[PDB]
Design a protein around this ligand. Structure first.
Ligand SMILES: *[C@@H]1O[C@H](CO)[C@@H](O[C@@H]2O[C@H](CO)[C@@H](O[C@@H]3O[C@H](CO[C@H]4O[C@H](CO)[C@@H](O)[C@H](O)[C@@H]4O)[C@@H](O)[C@H](O[C@H]4O[C@H](CO)[C@@H](O)[C@H](O)[C@@H]4O)[C@@H]3O)[C@H](O)[C@H]2NC(C)=O)[C@H](O)[C@H]1NC(C)=O
Ligand SMILES: *[C@@H]1O[C@H](CO)[C@@H](O[C@@H]2O[C@H](CO)[C@@H](O[C@@H]3O[C@H](CO[C@H]4O[C@H](CO)[C@@H](O)[C@H](O)[C@@H]4O)[C@@H](O)[C@H](O[C@H]4O[C@H](CO)[C@@H](O)[C@H](O)[C@@H]4O)[C@@H]3O)[C@H](O)[C@H]2NC(C)=O)[C@H](O)[C@H]1NC(C)=O
Ligand SMILES: *[C@@H]1O[C@H](CO)[C@@H](O[C@@H]2O[C@H](CO)[C@@H](O[C@@H]3O[C@H](CO[C@H]4O[C@H](CO)[C@@H](O)[C@H](O)[C@@H]4O)[C@@H](O)[C@H](O[C@H]4O[C@H](CO)[C@@H](O)[C@H](O)[C@@H]4O)[C@@H]3O)[C@H](O)[C@H]2NC(C)=O)[C@H](O)[C@H]1NC(C)=O
Ligand SMILES: CSC[C@]12C[C@@H]3C[C@](C(=O)N[C@H]4CC[C@H](N)CC4)(C1)C[C@@](c1ccccc1)(C3)C2
Ligand SMILES: CSC[C@]12C[C@@H]3C[C@](C(=O)N[C@H]4CC[C@H](N)CC4)(C1)C[C@@](c1ccccc1)(C3)C2
Ligand SMILES: CSC[C@]12C[C@@H]3C[C@](C(=O)N[C@H]4CC[C@H](N)CC4)(C1)C[C@@](c1ccccc1)(C3)C2
Ligand SMILES: *[C@@H]1O[C@H](CO)[C@@H](O)[C@H](O)[C@H]1NC(C)=O
Ligand SMILES: *[C@@H]1O[C@H](CO)[C@@H](O)[C@H](O)[C@H]1NC(C)=O
Ligand SMILES: *[C@@H]1O[C@H](CO)[C@@H](O)[C@H](O)[C@H]1NC(C)=O
Ligand SMILES: *[C@@H]1O[C@H](CO)[C@@H](O)[C@H](O)[C@H]1NC(C)=O
Ligand SMILES: *[C@@H]1O[C@H](CO)[C@@H](O)[C@H](O)[C@H]1NC(C)=O
Ligand SMILES: *[C@@H]1O[C@H](CO)[C@@H](O)[C@H](O)[C@H]1NC(C)=O
Ligand SMILES: *[C@@H]1O[C@H](CO)[C@@H](O)[C@H](O)[C@H]1NC(C)=O
Ligand SMILES: *[C@@H]1O[C@H](CO)[C@@H](O)[C@H](O)[C@H]1NC(C)=O
Ligand SMILES: *[C@@H]1O[C@H](CO)[C@@H](O)[C@H](O)[C@H]1NC(C)=O
Ligand SMILES: *[C@@H]1O[C@H](CO)[C@@H](O)[C@H](O)[C@H]1NC(C)=O
Ligand SMILES: *[C@@H]1O[C@H](CO)[C@@H](O)[C@H](O)[C@H]1NC(C)=O
Ligand SMILES: *[C@@H]1O[C@H](CO)[C@@H](O)[C@H](O)[C@H]1NC(C)=O
Lengths: 128, 240, 128, 240, 128, 240
């Protein structure tokens, strides 16, 4: 379903912070001893509400909370870092967790170019 | 049911149905997945100290839980709590190893004081998280700056100034809590919900420049006279 | 191989407890502040020995112990949460960790409907 | 070799051969995988305190290890140990953060007392685990209720009453350990292996109702006269 | 690219230590209570510089450091155990993270034996 | 960019390009992946205490980080540091739970002494790691034996003697550090960079056998007279 922002207000601009693990360091800045303190490891950006994504994001995070809290209640792990990796695994199992039946609705295999590759050969055989 | 995952489709953000498989969906690496934190501020909740502390409460029997997140929003309002019981014992646990304050706060509201603290940990009464440095917790840690927020998960498509505002509190965490904005260690202003951070800072500068600070050893408390828009779209006595 | 219970006794009924992370909460019960204490997060069930599964389970857990202990000896991780995720990864690598040769014994791709889809077209071409 | 994984096939539970690939096997998500704990009770081991404590022993040089598990079995018998050396130092480590007692126990056998405790941690001499709340450990934690058990891993197919029984122990963890069932702080019964929990509770009620508790400041110890089925299929002195 | 050792020296022999989690224990040695102390869990080996692998390994570890340090800076996890599992996931997503177009350069599906299996049938149909 | 992964191809070790997909590459299970640690020793760095301690330095503001590794190299030289400030406070943190010394060291150089320690943690000035028991850290832990090294990641293709050498140090971690090799608690030798471990052990044996140890209550310090190959390819006074 599409996300329906139902909040009293929406800040349409997202002034954000994050990190980058592939950050091209100049010289010795990548060496922990020489690099930035904890407060200086952040990049910043500004994202506007094109396609309504900012207001969608606020509503999505809001709606995620119940399921995320119920997950945290049931785990005995003190700090959970594994949610995204598990989602990537589930993405793969959904498609490849069983036999893939070509042309069936649960098999992400495109035989188009192979069907056409075969089709060009039969037209050649008929010419013979 | 399961934890939702946001995805961009038809020029709009959607939640992907797990019961339906879309082969056109492309996930090329784990670097295409992101966890992100958004601030309750951005939804229009009141951010003044009296209104915000009413959303938190003490509870026993529920183990704390932490989840990481990778990107967050610059905050206008963050909070930092040093709350003790009347007998001097700490109400909040020391921050666990590796948990630092939320990294971008225009104003840090630092509240010191006392309350009954009837529970082992302080939780968000609406189910939101306390956002720290790329870790979200269900509970408040002592003396550690946090923003109120919530977490989302995404498949991606293929200077800094901070000012600390200090407050004293009695009856923290109860129906009838009392707050004082601190000008110096002997000069306080009765806090109202309607006082914005910018107003408190101007009130502080005009007290210093007018010489309305206490000039005795005793504590001077001012009450301010009478004198709907979100932050991004814009001895006792009296003073009018 | 099939599991061979070789224990002195077997309790054929399994009165169990667990959690559910997708538990449909009523109202505010999902909010940690309002929800159950640590002692009340459990569901319960009772499973009987149909197909001998209970006695099989007891023997399986018994026989798992040596391999699980040797794994724990070799890891430096204080608390291990990753065994099931790693098994799901290995499940995928076993099938998709290399080129998939259709009709070969290590390639879980069924070309049946695609072979029949092609076969209906050749019979059409022969009719031409 | 590798950690076995149980799977249902031909109306029977099997261990899946890793050297052989079965394409008919369907794993549709991580929610189809489960780790489970089963109690040594269910295999018929003696569960009385004297028999069960003989299966545990102290050892140095081996770091403790924990593994999680997601579902477990209601226990008839669990144990909770407060063991000290004769000099008063603790024999068992405090429970690590986030480790709570096993969640379903009909009877908790709480043993307090002393032993030489010749080793840094207490391990299971048969390689079993100590089962706590969804965490299995190779070692015993102080004052923390556990069941003895073992862990399995599966691919799934596509009120509560607790009673604490208290004991004193000398020479805990040795060849010649002595156990006393505690009626009150001054009235004890010499423990035998053959005493079931239900018998100890009845023995306790008849001592209170008959007035056989100590009526001095001193310690009264009773020995009980002479008077193969598993739990699911069913001043000194004398008393006959 | 090939690894180019550019160190001042190279020890061409690798006297190494590691563990084995599938170690066939004799008798009760797998039981933690009875098994080796922390200092005795190690196997040892000696590897020589055939194909220049030892000197390659030293240079590889050297060159890995910048990227590994930048990764550690950006994570809030105190101890990272998940790098290899994440790499196995990325290995799978690179190949199977989308629709697999047979005969296309990003689809690791070999239709050779299936194309030949079809080819033997058409030659049979032509004989008819 | 991303963390490199080594792979054997054309009889040579290569780094695999992520931007290019090779279908002939076979990864059949996670057991085909390995993290490994290699010792800076193997690249020819000076290993004497004076040269090696110059590669480490104290720094505040940077949180420590640990990463595991599964196989390592036997070391000729490891180090173990007990450094205090002049006022007696510890300069290094106690080893976290589960971090033990590097498991194979021919010589452990144990340095005790004092320095200013101007920073919360000690880091490697060249970005290398401190290798412990299958854990690599960016920082040095107190009293815990480590080797200097770096980590790699691989796709695999389809007795022990230790000797401790003890030293005293003043001005540890500075431009002008002073080191003394310890013969007994009252007999020391001025350390030079050129002194190999084997030489220090022979110097120690000839001092005991010649009776050049202190025979007073006071501290005796010897200076040794004048008398390019890697380890795998091979009261003050004077002594010539
Ligand atoms: C996702 O987004 C939604 C929508 O924005 C958020 O919904 C809010 O949910 C909370 C509680 O879950 C609501 O707060 C409750 O409001 C009730 C009635 O509202 C009063 O206030 C409004 C003004 O906002 C008036 O219009 C109205 O007439 C009421 O006077 C209260 O009765 C509740 O009271 C409880 O708490 C108080 C405070 O301690 C106690 O004194 C009471 O005894 C009682 O226990 C409560 O305050 C809030 O109104 C909802 N907002 C909206 C806009 O619907 C979600 O919270 C959000 N999810 C997350 C995780 O952030
Ligand atoms: C998986 O399932 C199997 C089968 O149920 C379990 O097997 C048990 O393994 C333990 C040890 O690993 C066995 O215990 C040992 O028994 C030896 C002989 O048995 C005595 O007792 C039996 C009655 O059960 C008598 O019939 C027999 O004649 C013997 O008198 C003992 O010699 C051993 O003694 C050791 O420990 C004692 C106690 O401290 C010391 O005093 C000794 O010096 C010595 O070190 C030991 O007690 C047990 O018998 C096995 N049971 C069965 C039915 O075979 C596995 O343990 C289980 N795996 C897990 C992880 O739970
Ligand atoms: C991967 O492999 C490469 C190659 O082996 C290693 O490269 C080394 O990198 C370090 C620093 O990153 C280099 O050390 C620096 O050397 C500079 C000049 O070298 C002096 O010494 C050499 C002898 O080795 C002389 O030939 C030369 O003339 C110089 O006299 C110094 O100027 C630097 O000084 C800094 O530190 C000192 C010590 O505290 C301070 O006093 C200074 O003020 C200054 O801050 C520094 O010492 C080293 O030379 C490089 N070696 C080679 C062979 O190139 C990588 O380190 C390695 N990666 C990892 C992670 O191990
Ligand atoms: C189109 S929605 C994808 C976004 C776009 C912006 C940058 C984002 C990001 O984390 N990029 C990262 C991706 C990895 C890269 N190595 C470094 C940059 C991805 C975070 C973001 C966001 C969302 C909510 C709250 C805070 C921040 C803003 C959502
Ligand atoms: C046919 S064998 C699969 C079983 C069946 C029962 C329920 C199980 C379970 O955990 N279901 C869960 C699955 C996830 C769901 N969101 C909540 C319920 C799965 C646990 C169980 C068992 C086994 C041994 C010891 C204790 C418990 C009993 C094995
Ligand atoms: C051809 S390069 C693969 C190597 C070969 C040797 C054994 C290795 C290994 O860890 N084998 C393990 C694999 C799992 C098995 N259950 C037990 C043995 C794999 C480690 C090694 C190495 C590398 C650098 C530093 C130290 C050690 C040396 C690299
Ligand atoms: C205390 O709080 C309750 C609930 O919010 C409220 O009804 C009551 O009026 C408050 N004051 C007193 C004195 O109870
Ligand atoms: C104000 O009080 C605080 C705490 O009581 C103290 O740390 C601070 O130094 C005081 N400031 C002045 C100017 O006295
Ligand atoms: C209040 O005003 C004084 C006067 O400049 C200033 O030093 C002080 O920092 C101000 N307080 C705050 C919270 O800005
Ligand atoms: C002394 O304090 C009073 C009340 O705070 C104030 O009105 C007066 O101006 C002060 N005197 C000064 C600042 O000299
Ligand atoms: C102590 O234990 C050992 C071994 O279980 C046993 O042989 C011995 O008889 C016991 N008693 C004494 C006094 O040694
Ligand atoms: C019995 O002793 C325990 C511990 O010595 C104590 O905590 C408890 O209060 C005592 N009970 C009575 C009734 O004295
Ligand atoms: C023993 O009997 C008394 C008398 O009712 C009771 O209060 C006590 O709890 C009993 N002890 C146990 C362990 O049940
Ligand atoms: C006093 O104690 C004795 C021995 O325990 C017992 O026989 C007697 O009945 C007691 N007296 C009472 C309970 O009045
Ligand atoms: C101290 O160290 C610096 C930098 O290594 C060096 O230049 C200086 O000569 C040393 N000695 C003194 C006395 O500063
Ligand atoms: C030498 O000194 C150390 C520490 O000061 C001490 O532990 C050790 O016993 C001493 N050795 C002798 C032989 O006195
Ligand atoms: C130095 O020599 C004495 C004499 O044998 C010996 O006991 C001592 O261990 C030696 N020290 C070292 C570090 O080997
Ligand atoms: C006493 O000490 C001196 C200097 O260390 C040494 O030359 C002499 O041989 C010693 N006497 C002995 C060992 O009897």
């Amino acid at each position: 379903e599409a996300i329906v922002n139902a909040q009293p207000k929406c800040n349409p601009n997202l002034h954000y912070w994050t990190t980058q693990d592939e950050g091209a360091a100049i010289g010795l800045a990548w060496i922990p001893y020489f690099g930035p303190a904890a407060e200086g490891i952040y990049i910043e950006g500004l994202m506007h509400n094109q396609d309504g994504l900012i207001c969608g994001l606020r509503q999505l995070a809001n709606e995620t909370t119940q399921a995320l809290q119920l997950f945290l209640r049931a785990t005995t792990e003190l700090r959970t870092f594994s949610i995204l990796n598990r989602k990537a695994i589930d993405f793969l199992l959904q498609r490849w967790g069983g036999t893939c039946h070509i042309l069936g609705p649960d098999c992400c295999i495109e035989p188009a170019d192979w069907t056409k590759n075969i089709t060009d050969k039969i037209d050649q055989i008929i010419h013979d | 049911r399961s934890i939702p995952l946001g995805v961009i489709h038809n020029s709009a953000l959607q939640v992907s149905d797990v019961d339906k498989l879309v082969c056109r969906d492309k996930l090329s690496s784990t670097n295409q997945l992101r966890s992100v934190g958004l601030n309750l501020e951005g939804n229009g909740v009141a951010t003044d100290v009296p209104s915000a502390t009413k959303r938190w409460g003490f509870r026993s029997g529920v183990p704390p839980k932490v989840v990481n997140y990778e990107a967050g929003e610059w905050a206008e309002n963050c909070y930092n709590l040093e709350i003790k019981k009347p007998d001097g014992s700490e109400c909040l646990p020391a921050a666990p190893d590796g948990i630092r304050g939320f990294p971008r706060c225009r104003y840090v509201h630092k509240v010191s004081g006392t309350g009954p603290c009837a529970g082992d940990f302080a939780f968000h009464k609406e189910g939101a998280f306390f956002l720290y440095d790329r870790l979200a917790s269900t509970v408040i840690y002592r003396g550690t700056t946090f923003a109120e927020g919530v977490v989302a998960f995404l498949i991606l498509p293929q200077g800094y100034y901070s000012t600390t505002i200090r407050y004293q509190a009695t009856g923290f965490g109860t129906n009838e809590t009392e707050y004082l904005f601190e000008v110096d260690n002997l000069t306080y202003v009765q806090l109202e919900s309607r006082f914005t951070p910018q107003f408190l800072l101007q009130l502080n500068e005009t007290i210093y420049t007018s010489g309305k600070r206490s000039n005795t050893t005793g504590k001077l408390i001012w009450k301010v006279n009478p004198e709907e828009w979100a932050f991004w779209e814009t001895x006792x006595x009296x003073x009018x």
